[PDB]
C-alpha cells in the first residue's frame, strides 16, 4: 500500500451493524428529540409514551 492509494486499492473500513428483533430484549425506541415544556394551556403531551 501507500499513503495515497487510489480507489479500488486503498483500505476500506466498513461497519456492518446488523438489525434484529426477537425474544431477546427488543430495546427499540424512536428519534424522540426532547422539546420544551409549557403549562396552563390546552396542549398535546407525550410523556414517555
Amino acid at each position: 500500500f501507500q499513503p495515497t492509494n487510489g480507489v479500488g486499492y486503498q483500505p476500506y473500513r466498513v461497519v456492518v451493524l446488523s438489525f434484529e428483533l426477537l425474544h431477546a430484549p427488543a430495546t427499540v425506541c424512536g428519534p424522540k428529540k426532547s422539546t420544551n415544556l409549557v403549562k396552563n394551556k390546552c396542549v398535546n403531551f407525550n410523556f414517555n409514551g
Binding site: 425474544h23 431477546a24 430484549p25 427488543a26
Partner: protein
C-alpha cells in the same frame, strides 16, 4: 471464592449500585415477556 470458573460466551451485563442492605429483607423475583421483575 468457590462460585464459578469462567463465563465463556456471555450476554447483557450490569455492575453498579454499591449500596448496603431485628430486621427483615423480603425478596420477590418474577420474569414475564423477557423482563425480570424484582421487588
Amino acid at each position: 471464592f468457590r462460585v464459578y470458573s469462567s463465563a465463556n460466551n456471555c450476554t447483557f451485563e450490569y455492575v453498579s449500585q454499591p449500596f448496603l442492605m431485628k430486621n427483615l429483607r423480603e425478596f420477590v423475583f418474577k420474569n414475564i415477556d423477557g423482563y425480570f421483575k424484582i421487588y
